[PDB]
Write an enzyme that holds these catalytic residues in place. Structure first.
Site, mmCIF file in Angstrom:
data_model
loop_
_atom_site.group_PDB
_atom_site.id
_atom_site.type_symbol
_atom_site.label_atom_id
_atom_site.label_comp_id
_atom_site.label_asym_id
_atom_site.label_seq_id
_atom_site.Cartn_x
_atom_site.Cartn_y
_atom_site.Cartn_z
ATOM 1 C CG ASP A 16 -2.004 -1.059 1.127
ATOM 2 O OD1 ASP A 16 -2.237 -1.579 0.017
ATOM 3 O OD2 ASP A 16 -2.616 -1.373 2.169
ATOM 4 C CB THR A 51 -3.319 5.001 -1.196
ATOM 5 O OG1 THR A 51 -2.709 3.710 -1.073
ATOM 6 C CG2 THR A 51 -4.634 5.004 -0.434
ATOM 7 C CB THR A 52 -0.101 2.924 -5.135
ATOM 8 O OG1 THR A 52 0.182 2.231 -3.913
ATOM 9 C CG2 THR A 52 1.149 2.949 -5.998
ATOM 10 C CG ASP A 73 -6.313 -1.615 1.094
ATOM 11 O OD1 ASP A 73 -6.755 -0.950 2.055
ATOM 12 O OD2 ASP A 73 -5.108 -1.620 0.767
#
Lengths: 44, 518, 536, 518, 43
Positions: free
Chosen positions: D57, D90-91, D384
């Site tokens: 993540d 999020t990446t 996630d």
């Protein structure tokens, strides 16, 4: 044939994976002497 | 297992390729604002004696500023070679070689191009760039009138990037005539530059003769007409003969007075042979004592002492004479001729001015400036202009400047990129976009647009007009033949060849090894 | 301890001792760190490396001998590989990057055998027997090219030249470099095509201009200019002549003085007046001996006083000053002249002969350099290299130096091989075939030597972005189907894996030393048990 | 004059900028290798306690790594905001926000565009990108069959980058059934994740009912058939008397012996009110003393103590009952029923297992791994995946992923860029190329040439086919409808919105004032 | 407006400001020494 397709960049992970294998095999060498009925105890 | 010793810095990975490219960015950005007539000078803070130096030339800036990055030292060495070879364009080589790494950085990172592929891409790209300048070169040496006029336009381009861009119109004739006096000589050590502090900057002039800072010793008159000039390099002051194993064996001091008197007889006999030439002036590079100087008073011969050996060659070419030693034979020896010799004074220091000399093979340039920083800049500004004009007498080919030469080369690069195909097309086209940076920076220092203004120059060449160029005064496209912006062909090839070879250096470095300093 | 200090050797706590498996693991990993450095620069697709010296000077080269020479190391095992590439550059001068990769490949396959319980001497005994089997196999495959005449013999020299010129900076000019490197040996060589003298070819670098200005000049290039430069720069011979009659003198121009310290006592004015005439009579006599001998340019080792500046100018005799003693030997070889120790021994037969003597302006200021040309084939060939960077002018020296080392090795009779990885693959399958017949305890020794030879072809595929597995499998399957050994790895991607059509040629004496230097060095490394390293 | 003080680092103009761009490149390059199913995991080693963490993540990587760059924390906060609102991508937010600055770095440099002008370009580009992405969405939940199948395709896409990518085929059903049993309520407090050492990753099975690790009483049997489950908020503990704030006044010990006995009868009468329900199982939030425990043995009542705050609501919803406090009225707080209360054992720690309950509103996930480094990622991998599947219940709009969504949004950007006059049109086209950087990295991490795959995908969409995408298995262009790659519209909308706003902040910084650290 | 050139560098104009302040500070020291009413300076 060369100069085409892609070229490998950021080769540090290739060295990081080698540094992780060498460091892991070094730990496996000390415990290797304790394998089998002929193994020896490890005093810590 | 660490095979290297302590305090050894090495980067075997992406940190090395990043530090090599970024290291050239800080070097390229430092000399970027110094390109063009609208550029600004740079200030150098010395670490000792607090001696400030202000120079627009990129060769001095890169050598004075300490740089520990090997990627930076590559761009410093190519600037020292560009200064020592052609004498101009040290900034253009550093900028162009840095832009080649800028386009090569995005190909390795984004386009994922092999490093040698980018190098092999510049090989076929530089072949089309050098061949494009050959067909655009015009040789005017067939006419002495057109060749002399081209020497003026070349000087205006070099002096524009320096502080002399305002007075360059008056200084173009001074640099053009100084090279014409050499009669094809490429040696710049024959021209003397005397820097004088004070007065207007436009008061710099070029006399016909040799202006010497040294003055006559004691009784020699300042102004004399019809004086034959003679040059003697060796001894003539308290002759030691040759071997050091000579001594005087004296039984009584009565004979010792005759031995020292015989030394003065050797001095009088040597000066008596000089008067057989019929010269009104004698010059020695070695300093002359009081006894041999008084012998020239009754003979009416002038005397000059403490002349530098590099000025003797400059003096021998102005007078057209011959250096004379071993005066026993008058026949094989030749003397120089001068119409009038007057001692003038410029500032606090009086000078020795020559006029009406027979040979014009050498001259002396006198400069005026408000500060010594402007004097050091005026000498380096003319040193870069006289170096290009000196090589023009050898190779007479010229190429239009002012953003024209860079865009013409990019026209042939885009043509060869189609026949190569492969992945080298991104590398070949990267060389064409790298040539766009030189005319682009010219507009950036003048506060112009870096896109639409460049596009107008690019679209004008593809319409069949090769004489189009960039005009920084009006901020539009103008003809270079009418404005008189042209540079030597040797300067065009030197910038392209040096930048192409320097770009192939850092692109071949995967690993940077730093030994412990000593 | 019993309570008393026990010290066998001075600096007890300073020195350390390594033994057991940990001592062998540190030696193999020390070679793997050097291998991965050299494997990146191996092949024409390799990359150079920056060498920073403690004095601030930088060096950019891919040569394993130059990289390891200026490399400051700590572990002594990595220092043994430094002299390994130095052994390759000093004698043969080719393949310095291949001996390091092959030696570490032998150590990598030996580490796996040590963990299996094999005695290190048994590993070294298997590599020595496998080394002679690979050399004897490749020796039978190659053919003798000496049957061709001198016209075709020049072609083989151009073939091996272009191969050594690759992998190094400024490889685009290799076409002209290969032509200039062969013509140097064509001019300087024995009539029997044997034992050519390499010392007759000098490497003189020059910083400036561009690489396209490099050309062959037969003669002497000196850094000293003409004394008293009132004379013309370019000297021309007389209308009819036998030559320029170049003169070489190791004695400066001075009135004769004893070598021992002497005291000349003048007791009267008459004795002082005789010294005045005696002084000028010697300078007049020395300049007449050169004019009577017909000589023109005079070369002095220690120079001469300013008295002779105008004396030699009247007779139109060029002169140089402060010429080094080593350069005087280089002058007499080109012009075939003889050094004259004194004017009394000066004769017209000892004067050298060259085509023309002139100087070049080079750049703007720089320095004045003298150039000599020859009118025919002579024993002196001087290399002239130009470049826009100090690093280019430097590396180009050793680049053409190693290129001349390949040509002089071809002077040896009946030794040729084809490169591109075709030699290592041919010798690899010959060793693996013997392992099945011998079996025994040494069966695993031939396997380690066979897998080590394949590392060089697999390394070439890494720098070219290929698959080492698919490339090695094609070469091994080709040697089993057909006996042609000329199939190898192509890093340029021109197709036609046959080396005959690609012209790539290497010396056999260069490839034979790569196996000998790698095998014999690993035999000593595997014998190391106790490692005593003192503190600095 | 230094107003700020000593040890105050400040950068202005060109010094201030390029510190945020390089700061974003350093942050962007860390998560660049973690993007895509072929991405590489990054190991984080703490400076203390010697604790290592393996996580894919991009949000958890930036939180652990200390960053003193003020601009680096901008990309760290948006990674947390993206993790808080959604939890996935999020990446991609950190990369996309960094690529906006990399493209804008050349806009101010090459094209010489004011930073505020570039901001106006993203405002017009993001408005057209969200309109094209919204029209490409497909309505969901109108059919219960298509709604369940779409949730399976989402779990396979999110777990593709996780270490679960090998076993994610079997895990698609594990994460899907947990959301359907929530009955529309979106919370992750109802989902339990238990780490177990041993076995293999694919040994993870779905839990029928609710499983929570507890222990039976000393005298209480393990297996009870048709047991009634009750949860009590109040704890069995020494209560003093009632209101606390008191102490006993004992004149004679004759009343003190019966005084302590009266306290024993108070808790005995409280259990008598509990026994009126006829329950075979009792659960308390806090530790139970040994005295009330003995009353449960004679009444055949199981006891569970030390219940976590989250375990109270997880167990109450599965059984269907509610937490009981006063116990007074038996009619209120109707209780559910559990078929099998028998406890099982996984590893060396026995886990209490329930089966056949009334409601599945709460869930439990059993995970098995070799090391805790895998178990730490196995919890965050499903966290996630379950977060997006939970948001898909309330938000039914979904779009095609796998690099196709970024290319469709870039198609509408180049369409409106031709109608925008001025220098701000270059910033609009830069936003389109920045969207193409995400599918470009997908090919780089997979070992395939990015120039070939992106060029074939870009030209195929302009032909009118919007279903084309990137296939990393075969290294070619394939249909996303056949491969089954579906992502929620809320996921892609949060990536474009957060990245466009984060890059806008750093372009507005012309100065950085760093105060002296404490 | 938005089509203007930002030039990317505000440093060249800020460096000249620091050079003028230090240059005027030197000229203002000898200002009191100008004219018949000037004052001597002991160094």
């Amino acid at each position: 044939v060369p100069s085409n397709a892609t070229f490998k960049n950021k080769e540090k992970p290739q060295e990081v994976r080698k540094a992780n294998i060498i460091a892991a095999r070094s730990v496996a060498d000390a415990i290797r002497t304790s394998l089998g009925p002929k193994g020896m105890d490890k005093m810590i | 297992v660490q095979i290297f010793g302590d305090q050894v810095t090495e980067e075997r990975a992406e940190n090395a390729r990043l530090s090599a490219f970024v290291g050239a960015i800080a070097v390229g950005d430092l000399v970027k604002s110094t390109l063009g007539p609208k550029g600004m000078d740079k200030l150098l803070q010395s670490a000792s004696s607090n001696t400030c130096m202000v120079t627009n030339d990129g060769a001095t800036i890169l050598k004075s500023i300490p740089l520990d990055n090997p990627a930076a030292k590559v761009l410093v060495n190519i600037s020292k070679v560009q200064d020592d070879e052609v004498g101009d364009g040290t900034t253009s080589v550093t900028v162009l070689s840095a832009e080649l790494l800028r386009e090569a950085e995005k190909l390795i990172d984004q386009s994922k191009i092999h490093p040698q592929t980018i190098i092999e891409g510049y090989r076929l790209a530089s072949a089309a760039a050098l061949d494009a300048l050959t067909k655009a070169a015009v040789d005017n040496s067939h006419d002495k009138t057109m060749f002399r006029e081209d020497l003026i336009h070349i000087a205006k381009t070099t002096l524009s990037s320096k502080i002399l861009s305002q007075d360059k119109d008056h200084f173009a004739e001074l640099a053009t005539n100084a090279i014409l006096r050499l009669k094809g000589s490429t040696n710049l050590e024959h021209i003397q530059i005397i820097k004088i502090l004070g007065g207007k900057l436009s008061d710099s002039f070029l006399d016909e003769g040799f202006i010497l800072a040294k003055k006559f010793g004691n009784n020699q008159p300042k102004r004399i007409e019809n004086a034959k000039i003679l040059i003697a390099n060796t001894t003539l002051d308290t002759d030691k003969v040759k071997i050091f194993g000579t001594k005087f064996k004296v039984d009584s001091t009565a004979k010792l007075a005759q031995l020292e008197k015989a030394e003065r007889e050797k001095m009088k006999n040597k000066i008596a042979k000089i008067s057989k030439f019929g010269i009104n002036t004698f010059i020695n590079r070695q300093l002359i004592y009081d006894y041999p100087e008084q012998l020239f008073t009754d003979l009416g011969i002038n005397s000059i002492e403490h002349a530098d050996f590099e000025g003797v060659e400059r003096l021998a070419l102005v007078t057209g004479g011959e250096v004379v030693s071993t005066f026993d034979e008058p026949s094989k020896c030749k003397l120089g001729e001068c119409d009038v010799i007057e001692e003038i004074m410029l500032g606090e220091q009086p000078f020795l001015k020559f006029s009406g000399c027979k040979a014009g093979e050498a001259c002396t340039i006198v400069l005026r400036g408000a500060t010594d920083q402007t004097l050091d800049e005026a000498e380096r500004s003319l040193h870069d202009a006289l170096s290009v004009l000196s090589q023009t007498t050898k190779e007479t080919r010229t190429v239009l400047g002012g953003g024209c030469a860079e865009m013409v080369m990019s026209k042939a690069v885009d043509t060869e990129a189609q026949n190569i195909d492969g992945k080298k097309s991104l590398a070949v086209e990267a060389f064409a976009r790298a040539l766009r940076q030189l005319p682009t920076i010219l507009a950036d220092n003048a506060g112009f647009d870096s896109s639409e203004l460049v596009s107008k120059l690019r679209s004008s060449i593809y319409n069949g007009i090769s004489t189009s160029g960039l005009d920084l005064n009006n901020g539009t496209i103008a003809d270079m033949r009418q404005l008189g912006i042209v540079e030597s062909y040797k300067l065009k090839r030197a910038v392209v060849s040096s930048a192409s070879e320097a770009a192939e250096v850092l692109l071949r470095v995967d690993n940077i090894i730093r030994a412990r300093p000593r | 301890e019993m309570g008393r200090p026990f010290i066998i050797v001075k600096d007890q706590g300073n020195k350390k001792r390594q033994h057991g498996l940990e001592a062998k693991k540190s030696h193999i990993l020390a070679a793997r760190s050097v291998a991965s450095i050299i494997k990146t620069s191996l092949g024409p697709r390799g990359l150079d490396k920056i060498l920073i010296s403690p004095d601030g000077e930088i060096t950019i080269t891919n040569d394993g001998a130059t990289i390891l020479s200026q490399m400051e190391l700590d572990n002594e095992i990595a220092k043994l590989l430094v002299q390994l590439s130095k052994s390759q550059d000093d004698e043969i001068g080719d393949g310095t990057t291949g001996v390091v990769v092959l030696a570490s490949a032998l150590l990598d396959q030996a580490l796996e055998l040590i963990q299996k319980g094999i005695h290190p001497i048994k590993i070294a005994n298997g590599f020595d027997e496998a080394a002679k089997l690979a050399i004897s196999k490749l020796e039978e495959t190659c053919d003798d090219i000496s049957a061709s005449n001198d016209e075709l013999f020049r072609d083989f020299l151009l073939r091996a030249a272009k191969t050594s010129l690759g992998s190094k900076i400024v490889s685009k000019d290799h076409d002209r470099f290969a032509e200039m490197a062969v013509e140097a040996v064509i001019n300087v060589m024995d009539k029997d095509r044997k034992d050519v003298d390499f010392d007759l070819i000098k490497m003189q670098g020059r910083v400036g201009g561009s690489i396209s200005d490099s050309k062959l000049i037969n003669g002497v290039i000196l850094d000293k200019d003409f004394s008293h430069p009132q004379m013309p720069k370019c000297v021309l011979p007389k209308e009819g002549s036998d030559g320029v009659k170049l003169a070489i003198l190791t004695c400066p121009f001075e009135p004769p003085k004893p070598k021992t310290k002497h005291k000349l006592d003048i007791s009267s004015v008459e004795e002082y007046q005789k010294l005045q005439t005696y002084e000028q009579d010697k300078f007049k006599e020395m300049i007449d001996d050169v004019k009577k001998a017909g000589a023109d340019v005079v070369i002095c080792q220690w120079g001469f006083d300013d008295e002779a500046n105008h004396l030699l100018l009247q007779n139109d005799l060029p002169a140089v000053r402060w010429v080094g003693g080593q350069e005087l030997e280089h002058i007499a070889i080109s012009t075939n002249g003889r050094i004259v120790p004194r004017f009394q021994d000066l004769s017209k037969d000892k004067l050298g002969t060259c085509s023309r003597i002139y100087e070049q302006e080079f750049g703007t200021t720089k320095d004045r350099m003298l150039i000599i040309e020859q009118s025919k084939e002579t024993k002196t060939v001087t290399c002239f290299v130009r470049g826009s960077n100090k690093m280019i002018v430097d590396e180009a020296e050793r680049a053409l130096h190693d290129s001349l080392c390949v040509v002089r090795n071809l002077v040896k009779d009946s030794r040729v091989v084809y490169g591109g990885g075709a030699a290592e693959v041919t010798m690899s399958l010959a060793v693996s075939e013997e392992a099945d017949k011998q079996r025994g305890i040494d069966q695993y020794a031939f396997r380690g030597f066979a897998q080590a030879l394949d590392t060089i072809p697999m390394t070439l595929a890494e720098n070219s972005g290929l698959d080492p597995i698919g490339t090695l499998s094609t070469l091994k399957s080709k040697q089993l189907k057909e006996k042609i050994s000329n199939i190898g790895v192509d890093c340029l991607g021109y197709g036609s894996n046959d080396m005959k059509e690609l012209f790539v040629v290497d010396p056999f004496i260069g490839k034979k030393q790569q196996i000998l230097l790698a095998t014999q060095l690993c035999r000593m490394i595997l014998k190391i048990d106790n490692v005593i390293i003192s503190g600095k």
